[PDB]
RNA sequence: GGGGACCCACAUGGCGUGUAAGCCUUUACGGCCCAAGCGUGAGUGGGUGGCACAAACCAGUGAGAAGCGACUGUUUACUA
RNA sequence: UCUACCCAUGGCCAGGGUGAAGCGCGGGUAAGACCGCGUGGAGGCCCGAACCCACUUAGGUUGAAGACUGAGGGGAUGAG
RNA sequence: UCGAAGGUGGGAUCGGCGAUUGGGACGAAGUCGUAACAAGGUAGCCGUACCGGAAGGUGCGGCUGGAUC
RNA sequence: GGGAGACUGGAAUUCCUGGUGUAGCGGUGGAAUGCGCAGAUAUCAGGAGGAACACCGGUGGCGAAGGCGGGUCUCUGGGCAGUAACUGACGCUGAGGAGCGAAAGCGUGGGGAGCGAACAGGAUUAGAUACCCUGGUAGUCCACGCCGUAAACGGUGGGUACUAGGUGUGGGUUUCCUUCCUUGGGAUCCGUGCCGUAGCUAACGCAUUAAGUACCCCGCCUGGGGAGUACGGCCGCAAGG
RNA sequence: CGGCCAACUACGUGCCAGCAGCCGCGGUAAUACGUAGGGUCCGAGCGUUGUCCGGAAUUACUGGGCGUAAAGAGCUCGUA
RNA sequence: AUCAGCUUGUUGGUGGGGUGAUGGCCUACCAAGGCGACGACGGGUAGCCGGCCUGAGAGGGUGACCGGCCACACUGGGAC
């Protein structure tokens with residue numbers, strides 16, 4: 001789990017402003033950092049099914065948020081997906 | 089790990105091998121190679137000493153630092169964990185600080201980059217050879233010697249090696265892979281950690297060509313042997329010989345261990361199987 | 364199961380190679396292309412001859428069951 | 444000096460197909476697994492000469508030969 | 524050139540029959556048995572593996588649609 | 593006690609070694625197969641190995657469900673209360689599809705103290721191929737794959753809004769008799785037991801954690817055998833699903 | 834012409850001979866079998882048989898349930 | 914779905930022929946796709962409709978006669 005230092009760094013550095021925290025950009029940023037970090041952990045730890053449940057839940061949540069961003073604005077969706085370098 | 093081969097031909101249907109992803113160099117050091125040849129299962133006298141083996145694929149020899157005692161106090165990084173077929177295990181060359189490179193047995197899970205010390209000050213990471221004065225009781229050990237400084241002979245099985253039990257007086261107790269306990273000097277040389285290639289037992293042989301390559305000759309069953317050649321010989325049809333199995337060399341199954349060895353007093357009990 | 368030979372046209376066609384000449388430079392036994400020249404398969408139409416167009420030589424018989432042996436292998440040189 | 448086995452050093456296998464892992468791209472996943480596309484020629488793989496064998500038949504059997512010849516026959520990158 | 528009928532050869536569907544075998548239901552009545560329903564005289568049942576002419580027995584795990592205390 | 597890896601502890605069983613110590617020890621409704629006189633049982637000292645964590649431990653906690661508890665570290669999921677800064681229709685359920693999943697079973701390679709299918713004897717019965725006793729092979733343990741079924745039960749899919757209470761438990765915020773100790777008193781949200789209205793139900797019964805009154809979507813059923821079976825199709829090496 | 838279903842007594846054989854849409858009727862004294870009368874229904878038609886709907890809310894959109902009678906998939910993530 | 918992929922004039926464009934009329938109706942040349950889980954392609958049955966019966970209705974069953982079309986004339990084709 002992310003802690004205060006890097007988490008505030010991320011929310012500010014991908015934030016639209018210096019105060020907003022619940023923006024979809026920051027939400028997707030936190031979800032992505034969590035998934036890469038804990039996927040790196042699960043590359044070592046194989047049979048943690050209770051945590052793979054968290055993987056799947058957070059990923060479906062992410063997919064819903066990305067769908068919302070694409071629906072609300074194509075330009076912001078493209079900018080986000082290009083800045084994070086993912087496929088969809 | 090283990091990679092299974094697809095059935096391209098009826099012959100190699102079942103052949104599966106332990107893929108050697110643990111290889112770093114492909115051309116062995118030319119300086120340390122000594123002239124060797126397949127003896128063909130025969131002595132210099134010309135008689136076949138032991139059947140079922142001989143012929144095959146001529147191979148080279150290289151000196152392994154089994155008895156590492158000459159130089160101590162100097163570190164060494166793992167140079168390149170290469171493949172030596174003359175053993176089940178692998179050999180990982182080392183760049184010692186004096187510049188004198190010797191092959192050693194590669195322990196389990198050794199990768200390029202670890203620093204290996206050989207002496208009293210050596211720590212507990214695998215590959216460190218050190219006398220029993222500087223080892224905790226209960227650690228898994230390999231490449232174990234028998235006296236303080238006469239060259240190491242035992243504990244080099246890939247996957248299961250001797251386990252130290254305890255030290256009392258000037259004699260130390262060693263647990264065998266068979267489940268036995270042997271008394272040995274507290275000053276012999278022994279290394280820490282199991283030996284690699286534990287997955288080698290999962291190798292599937294595959295055919296006869298690999299096996300003539302490896303060295304063994306086809307096995308001729310006694311029940312079809314000729315009666316003059318073998319006590320199991322003869323018969324019109326399939327017969328077991330009408331008597332308990334016996335090596336055609338005269339002696340049947342039974343005790344073969346001649347007692348009264350100098351280390352016989354250094355053994356507590358013999359192996360018991362299938363318990 | 365079908366086509367397979369020859370001639371013409373498509374066709375100064377496509378492909379490879381590559382000269383003169385052209386382009387360039389750390390100028391050399393230099394990289395790019397390459398009219399010309401040389402070699403060249405493939406196909407579609409039209410027509411022609413024979414009984415027969417892989418016509419010679421060369422060059423798998425196929426299918427259905429069941430027994431033994433998993434298969435490649437080796438052996439009774441000179442009865443298997 | 445044949446034959447059986449092994450040891451060491453050399454040599455031999457025309458030609459034509461089958462297309463594993465691996466590799467990159469587009470899908471698939473969050474990562475996979477997996478799905479097609481282009482390189483791969485791994486195989487005691489396939490067809491087939493040199494080479495090595497000896498399954499069938501005919502001849503021969505006071506023969507050309509004290510174990511062959513002629514048609515077919517098997518392996519032919521390997522236990523050669 | 525097309526062209527129906529005819530003949531070559533192998534794949535699917537519908538079938539009809541087929542020695543014998545496997546299973547099911549209805550007869551009524553007989554032998555072998557005690558399975559379950561009351562703590563049915565070993566609590567029952569479910570999943571699963573083994574065993575035995577037979578109902579069943581046992582192992583492991585799960586429920587109370589189990590009675591006493 | 594949410595999950596995974598590693599390290600570690602004690603008690604107990606069995607076995608081995610060495611004392612002491614003598615003719616029995618184990619067994620059931622009763623006895624005999626069993627081990628002893630080659631020294632059993634008992635008991636002391638030491639060691640070895642494998643499994644599981646008695647008390648706390650409960651109609652208590654967590655997890656979506658199977659289920660989960662000796663400690664210690666390492667990394668990590670889910671849920672809850674307050675401030676409510678921000679996003680501003682992103683919510684729900686989900687045919688086909690995909691992932692997890694009790695025990696048993698299978699392959700490979702290890703482990704294997706206790707327990708224990710199968711199988712031998714001893715016992716009862718007219719009869720025991722069972723219930724009982726003595727032994728003990730798979731399995732029960734570990735790693736990688738597999739099968740994917742349970743009375744997998746709350747025999748009740750999930751989500752939302754509303755509808756009288758009483759009595760316990762857990763977690764967190766507040767305030768007030770105020771010692772400001774106190775399950776003191778009060779307010780609030782979440783979880784989990786018991787009894788009860790109106791209501792529903794054929795009855796037993798449920799009763800804010802509904803089977804109450806509704807909304808949204810999904811699966812399932814149309815008399816009992818045949819039969820969860822044949823064929824066909826899919827998965828699995830097979831058992832088989 | 835037993836109850837469903839408006840219409841009963843006697844005579845003849847008794848687990849036989851027989852009736853019948855559901856329950857079901859005869860094992861010496863049958864309103865259910867056969868014959869007589871008697872009554873009921875219908876009528877130039879009377880019954881049997883076969884197909885179709887209704888009652889069947891027994892495929893429930895109007896208008897059914899899933900605790901035990903048939904049923905909540907083992908449970909989640911999640912595409913259309 | 915105890916029928917998951919179908920199709921190669923198949924799909925689309927251009928140029929020609931074709932027919933009373935536009936059109937892959939037919940030919941040539943270009944590109945690779947169209948139809949497909951809001952059930953394609955497969956398997957069985959069957960002429961459709963105004964109507965008839967039943968049912969309060971919804972609905973279910975059905976196509977007697979008449980009438981509006983459809984298709985055929987012993988079987989399969991072809992044309993004036």
Ligand SMILES: [Mg+2]
Nearest residue numbers: 001002668669
């Ligand atoms: Mg946390």
Ligand SMILES: [Mg+2]
Nearest residue numbers: 099101102103
């Ligand atoms: Mg094999």
Ligand SMILES: [Mg+2]
Nearest residue numbers: 122123149150
């Ligand atoms: Mg050498």
Ligand SMILES: [Mg+2]
Nearest residue numbers: 132133134135
């Ligand atoms: Mg001599």
Ligand SMILES: [Mg+2]
Nearest residue numbers: 139140141307
């Ligand atoms: Mg041998």
Ligand SMILES: [Mg+2]
Nearest residue numbers: 143144449450
């Ligand atoms: Mg040789």
Ligand SMILES: [Mg+2]
Nearest residue numbers: 173175176177
């Ligand atoms: Mg090796």
Ligand SMILES: [Mg+2]
Nearest residue numbers: 307308309310
């Ligand atoms: Mg043998």
Ligand SMILES: [Mg+2]
Nearest residue numbers: 311312313314
């Ligand atoms: Mg022999």
Ligand SMILES: [Mg+2]
Nearest residue numbers: 315316318319
């Ligand atoms: Mg002899």
Ligand SMILES: [Mg+2]
Nearest residue numbers: 314316317318
């Ligand atoms: Mg001899």
Ligand SMILES: [Mg+2]
Nearest residue numbers: 321322323324
């Ligand atoms: Mg013999």
Ligand SMILES: [Mg+2]
Nearest residue numbers: 324325326327
């Ligand atoms: Mg015999």
Ligand SMILES: [Mg+2]
Nearest residue numbers: 332333340341
């Ligand atoms: Mg013997």
Ligand SMILES: [Mg+2]
Nearest residue numbers: 266268358359
């Ligand atoms: Mg031993």
Ligand SMILES: [Mg+2]
Nearest residue numbers: 381395396397
């Ligand atoms: Mg040039």
